[PDB]
Design a protein around this ligand. Structure first.
Ligand SMILES: CCCCCCCCCCCCCCCCCC(=O)OC[C@H](COP(=O)([O-])OC[C@H](O)COP(=O)([O-])OC[C@H](COC(=O)CCCCCCCCCCCCCCCCC)OC(=O)CCCCCCCCCCCCCCCCC)OC(=O)CCCCCCCCCCCCCCCCC
Lengths: 171, 63
């Protein structure tokens, strides 16, 4: 068959979000609130293209919008967030329920200094509508022409010509 | 019976039986072509229904 078409190594270079998983999980609800739009454009492009190579640029927007999410935490509320992801980082299963006072301090400092509302129980699992200008992929499976089906039956059913025609049976 | 009666009755018998014989030869040729090509209503052995396929958005996108 054909050559697989991969992007080059310079096409994949982007400033990564070089933080740990507890830093991400501690900031997760405000990330799902504030970084909604490029993330949903990316995941819509990701389920519609069904090909990561056609989803790189939108993905870079994700990696553009996450970092600006953290710098805006780093410029204003670096220390309550630092205590909060440290307390999240202690636990094995990384429980939100073991760290409610640092969560309250972080949410209070964020709501005062930046004006972000933490999403409630039920909001981040909603299915939202996304306004994009990219075209809908007309063939995301790279399929081809389906074969022509067999012709159907039509016409009124006439009786059998001279019956069964089985050797001598005249009916 | 009259010779006219037997004669024309024999012609009716020969019409019916020659038509049955030509239809049997056509039936054999139709069966041969439908088994060879598979494009007729006979020998349509079952394949999988595509109404069974789930086209919902799945868990991972690459599918
Ligand atoms: C106002 C509204 C109402 C009006 C009503 C008007 C009518 C009133 C009466 C209605 C009731 C029906 C009466 C009979 C209608 C005519 C049927 C007929 O004779 O067909 C001739 C039929 C074909 O002859 P034909 O010259 O081409 O056409 C004349 C008709 O137009 C044939 O016409 P067809 O083209 O339409 O026929 C179709 C086709 C025409 O036939 C064919 O296409 C040829 C192939 C037929 C089958 C051949 C099989 C061969 C291998 C097995 C042989 C088994 C052993 C033989 C018998 C041993 C004895 C048991 O027949 C069949 O497919 C049926 C199979 C044969 C059954 C016939 C009816 C029997 C009814 C009584 C049963 C009594 C026992 C009978 C013997 C048992 C075995 C059948 O003859 C044969 O097949 C030879 C056998 C004789 C037939 C049965 C005789 C019936 C009367 C029997 C009285 C005596 C009984 C004694 C005791 C029992 C025996 C121990």
């Amino acid at each position: 068959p054909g050559i697989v078409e991969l992007p080059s190594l310079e096409d994949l270079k982007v400033q990564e979000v070089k933080v740990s998983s507890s830093v991400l999980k501690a900031a997760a609800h405000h990330y799902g609130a504030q970084c909604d739009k490029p993330n949903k454009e990316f995941m819509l492009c990701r389920w519609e293209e069904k090909d990561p190579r056609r989803c790189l640029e939108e993905g870079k927007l994700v990696n553009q919008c996450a970092l600006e999410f953290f710098r805006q935490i780093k410029r204003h509320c670096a220390e309550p967030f630092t205590e909060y992801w440290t307390c999240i980082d202690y636990s094995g299963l990384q429980l939100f329920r073991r760290c409610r006072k640092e969560q309250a301090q972080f949410d209070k400092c964020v709501l005062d200094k930046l004006g972000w509302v933490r999403p409630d129980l039920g909001e981040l699992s909603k299915v939202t509508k996304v306004k994009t200008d990219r075209p809908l992929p007309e063939n995301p499976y790279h399929s081809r022409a389906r074969p022509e089906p067999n012709p159907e039956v039509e016409g009124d059913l006439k009786p059998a010509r001279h019956g069964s025609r089985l050797f001598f049976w005249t009916m | 019976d009259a010779p006219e009666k037997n004669y024309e009755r024999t012609m009716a018998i020969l019409q019916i039986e020659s038509e049955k014989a030509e239809l049997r030869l056509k039936e054999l040729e139709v069966r041969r072509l439908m088994r060879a090509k598979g494009d007729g209503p006979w020998f349509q052995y079952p394949t999988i229904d595509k109404a069974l396929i789930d086209h919902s958005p799945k868990a991972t996108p690459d599918n």
